[PDB]
Amino acid sequence: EPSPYVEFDRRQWRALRMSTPLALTEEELVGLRGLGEQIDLLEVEEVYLPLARLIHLQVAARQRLFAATAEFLGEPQQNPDRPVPFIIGVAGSVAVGKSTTARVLQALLARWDHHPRVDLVTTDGFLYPNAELQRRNLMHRKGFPESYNRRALMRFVTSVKSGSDYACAPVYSHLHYDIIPGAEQVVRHPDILILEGLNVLQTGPTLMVSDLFDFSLYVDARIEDIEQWYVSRFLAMRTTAFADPESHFHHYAAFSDSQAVVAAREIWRTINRPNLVENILPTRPRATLVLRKDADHSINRLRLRKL
Amino acid sequence: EPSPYVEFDRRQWRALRMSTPLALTEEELVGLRGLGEQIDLLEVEEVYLPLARLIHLQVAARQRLFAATAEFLGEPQQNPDRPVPFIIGVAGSVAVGKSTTARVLQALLARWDHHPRVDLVTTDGFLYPNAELQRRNLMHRKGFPESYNRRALMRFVTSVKSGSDYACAPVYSHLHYDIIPGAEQVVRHPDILILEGLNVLQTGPTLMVSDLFDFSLYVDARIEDIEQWYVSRFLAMRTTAFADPESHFHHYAAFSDSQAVVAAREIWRTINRPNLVENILPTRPRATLVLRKDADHSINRLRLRKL
Numbered sequence: 239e240p241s242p243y244v245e246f247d248r249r250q251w252r253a254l255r256m257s258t259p260l261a262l263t264e265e266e267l268v269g270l271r272g273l274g275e276q277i278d279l280l281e282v283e284e285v286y287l288p289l290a291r292l293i294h295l296q297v298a299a300r301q302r303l304f305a306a307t308a309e310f311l312g313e314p315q316q317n318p319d320r321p322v323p324f325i326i327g328v329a330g331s332v333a334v335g336k337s338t339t340a341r342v343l344q345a346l347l348a349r350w351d352h353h354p355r356v357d358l359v360t361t362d363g364f365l366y367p368n369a370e371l372q373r374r375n376l377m378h379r380k381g382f383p384e385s386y387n388r389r390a391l392m393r394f395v396t397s398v399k400s401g402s403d404y405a406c407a408p409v410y411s412h413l414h415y416d417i418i419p420g421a422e423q424v425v426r427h428p429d430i431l432i433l434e435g436l437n438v439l440q441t442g443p444t445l446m447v448s449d450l451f452d453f454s455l456y457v458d459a460r461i462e463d464i465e466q467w468y469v470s471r472f473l474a475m476r477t478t479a480f481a482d483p484e485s486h487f488h489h490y491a492a493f494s495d496s497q498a499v500v501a502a503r504e505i506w507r508t509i510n511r512p513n514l515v516e517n518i519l520p521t522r523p524r525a526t527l528v529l530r531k532d533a534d535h536s537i538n539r540l541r542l543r544k545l
Numbered sequence: 546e547p548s549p550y551v552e553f554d555r556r557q558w559r560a561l562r563m564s565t566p567l568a569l570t571e572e573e574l575v576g577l578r579g580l581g582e583q584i585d586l587l588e589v590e591e592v593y594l595p596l597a598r599l600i601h602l603q604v605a606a607r608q609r610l611f612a613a614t615a616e617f618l619g620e621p622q623q624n625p626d627r628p629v630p631f632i633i634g635v636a637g638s639v640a641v642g643k644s645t646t647a648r649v650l651q652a653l654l655a656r657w658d659h660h661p662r663v664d665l666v667t668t669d670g671f672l673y674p675n676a677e678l679q680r681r682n683l684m685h686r687k688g689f690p691e692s693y694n695r696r697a698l699m700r701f702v703t704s705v706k707s708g709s710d711y712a713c714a715p716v717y718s719h720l721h722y723d724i725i726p727g728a729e730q731v732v733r734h735p736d737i738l739i740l741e742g743l744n745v746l747q748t749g750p751t752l753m754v755s756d757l758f759d760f761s762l763y764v765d766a767r768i769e770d771i772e773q774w775y776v777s778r779f780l781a782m783r784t785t786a787f788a789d790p791e792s793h794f795h796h797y798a799a800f801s802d803s804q805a806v807v808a809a810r811e812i813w814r815t816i817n818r819p820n821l822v823e824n825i826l827p828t829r830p831r832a833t834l835v836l837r838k839d840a841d842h843s844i845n846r847l848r849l850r851k852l
């Protein structure tokens with residue numbers, strides 16, 4: 239019964255490593271690992287290395303495709319130092335570990351042979367600032383599709399992929415819970431752009447960033463596990479981020495375990511869960527690769543689109 | 546101000562013909578032309594021939610892409626007599642001329658060098674039959690997304706693209722206004738499948754045929770012109786299709802010009818216009834190529850996705 243997809247387990251997947259080199263040390267992996275994430279070198283080797291191989295294979299093939307169009311159009315040819323940027327989306331729930339997957343992927347790709355320039359941008363820079371969300375009644379919907387300046391986000395990625403020298407994204411601060419005035423992330427004709435955020439795989443009545451992706455990941459897990467990870471990270475942040483007096487959620491620093499669980503579950507119930515179910519999970523069917531994690535953050539299963 | 550698209554006029558577009566051969570005679574073009582359509586050899590040469598070139602370029606590049614995935618997976622390689630089928634979508638309003646564009650494209654592609662097997666399937670075979678539409682209260686919504694068995698349609702295209710030997714689509718009769726019992730269109734590992742229908746470029750919370758397209762056309766025109774074409778074809782069918790006593794709309798055969806205009810405008814107003822505005826036109830942004838026709842059915846402008 240034919241399928242666009244093929245499923246693997248970790249055994250099956252890790253065999254596809256071939257002889258892709260491991261270019262990353264244990265200390266280097268630490269700088270990449272997010273609070274609460276469990277990634278080790280073994281996981282890098284068995285899961286991320288075949289991924290990086292898949293992508294290397296696709297970057298070459300995908301260039302052919304733009305080149306055929308440029309040929310058709312009777313066009314100059316290509317700068318071989320500036321190919322069309324390969325755009326990689328990374329999607330999934332809050333707390334599922336997207337930021338680790340993306341940082342690790344970036345680090346692996348930047349260590350391929352020619353040392354490609356590999357940029358990583360998070361869509362939280364494209365959230366409306368609080369004063370605008372407040373205007374729109376959206377202060378309790380950060381991460382919902384409507385809380386983003388989608389036009390700006392699409393402009394940004396179109397600019398990069400169309401080969402602009404320079405493009406700027408705004409910058410969000412979790413600690414201050416708002417866009418940072420005057421802050422910009424500048425992307426300068428990278429070879430590869432990884433775009434990471436809850437809703438990057440969305441589709442709609444207009445052309446969207448997902449329509450520009452040459453590859454996408456969705457980082458998945460059971461909803462109950464993701465909630466547990468969220469609540470557990472909320473409790474852990476009492477003595478990390480929330481302990482900063484400047485932190486927007488500094489008042490949570492002093493909560494007891496049981497108060498903190500209450501608070502975190504209410505945020506999950508009223509914001510992150512509804513967003514996952516209504517907006518994020520309906521984008522999973524389109525991902526080129528789903529990385530499914532077990533309750534321990536271990537990626538044990540994968541679903542690859544072959545069509 | 547960068548753009549996924551590039552616009553042409555007919556001058557600009559026709560220069561991209563290069564020396565693509567014209568393999569089609571005036572008599573052959575007649576068999577392809579729909580009631581009310583204006584296509585001539587000149588239009589074939591200036592518009593359809595560069596299109597066919599673009600596609601030839603893309604079929605080769607696109608194969609590379611599946612081959613890279615097959616390589617990654619350590620897979621046999623490919624039957625060179627059975628490559629992965631290249632899937633072409635053709636979308637747009639009722640009465641806009643999709644069936645002519647698709648028949649002409651099929652005829653041009655089947656006349657490339659190796660004589661590729663080029664199948665053409667219309668999504669009207671995937672409409673629910675009347676008894677089922679009646680059950681669902683949809684007898685006045687034929688052509689709306691919900692009037693189709695989308696699961697069956699997706700099964701069909703997945704099967705073909707995944708390399709099945711044989712796949713069957715049901716068959717709709719306009720004359721009898723219903724799916725034809727026991728009729729099947731059998732598609733046998735074509736090299737190219739053209740899938741034509743109002744809503745083929747739709748996207749949604751599940752993987753859809755548009756997610757399987759290697760190329761798509763949208764046949765566009767101003768809404769007022771399309772309505773004029775629709776009403777004018779309705780009046781012309783009084784002495785063609787509706788004149789058949791078996792015809793479902795045989796009672797319209799005897800209408801005066803002015804009665805027929807009334808009838809046809811009401812159908813446009815209550816079915817086809819709402820469908821165009823709510824469902825079809827929101828898919829235009831995704832088409833690889835928009836063919837924009839002037840009031841005379843003349844394709845005078847084109848919009849190509851380069852990203």
Ligand SMILES: Nc1nc2c(ncn2[C@@H]2O[C@H](COP(=O)(O)OP(=O)(O)O)[C@@H](O)[C@H]2O)c(=O)[nH]1
Pocket residue numbers: 272273330331332333334335336337338412413475479487
């Ligand atoms: N300072 C601070 N950082 C947070 C908070 N919530 C999430 N983060 C960080 O924001 C980044 C994105 O987190 P999240 O949106 O849950 O996406 P994830 O990467 O898939 O877990 C991660 O580095 C989190 O550690 C918060 O409340 N305060």
Ligand SMILES: Nc1nc2c(ncn2[C@@H]2O[C@H](COP(=O)(O)OP(=O)(O)O)[C@@H](O)[C@H]2O)c(=O)[nH]1
Pocket residue numbers: 579580637638639640641642643644645719720782786794
């Ligand atoms: N017999 C008959 N054929 C029709 C009728 N309406 C449309 N057709 C034919 O059905 C095919 C599809 O028409 P339409 O859905 O308008 O799509 P188009 O190909 O873009 O014009 C065309 O060949 C039309 O000639 C009808 O009421 N009766």
Ligand SMILES: CC(C)(COP(=O)(O)O)[C@@H](O)C(=O)NCCC(=O)O
Pocket residue numbers: 332360361362363377378379380381412434435436437505509
């Ligand atoms: C910033 C986020 C919306 C994620 O943004 P992303 O980069 O995935 O677009 C999420 O990490 C977040 O901080 N949500 C806050 C929910 C609340 O208002 O408490």
Ligand SMILES: CC(C)(COP(=O)(O)O)[C@@H](O)C(=O)NCCC(=O)O
Pocket residue numbers: 639667668669670684685686687688719741742743744812816
């Ligand atoms: C059959 C159609 C819905 C087009 O089908 P398609 O192949 O575009 O999916 C349209 O040609 C049609 O016949 N509409 C009928 C509207 C009515 O019920 O009178």
Ligand code: NA
Pocket residue numbers: 273274275333334335467
């Ligand atoms: Na996590």
Ligand code: NA
Pocket residue numbers: 580581582640641642774
């Ligand atoms: Na027409």
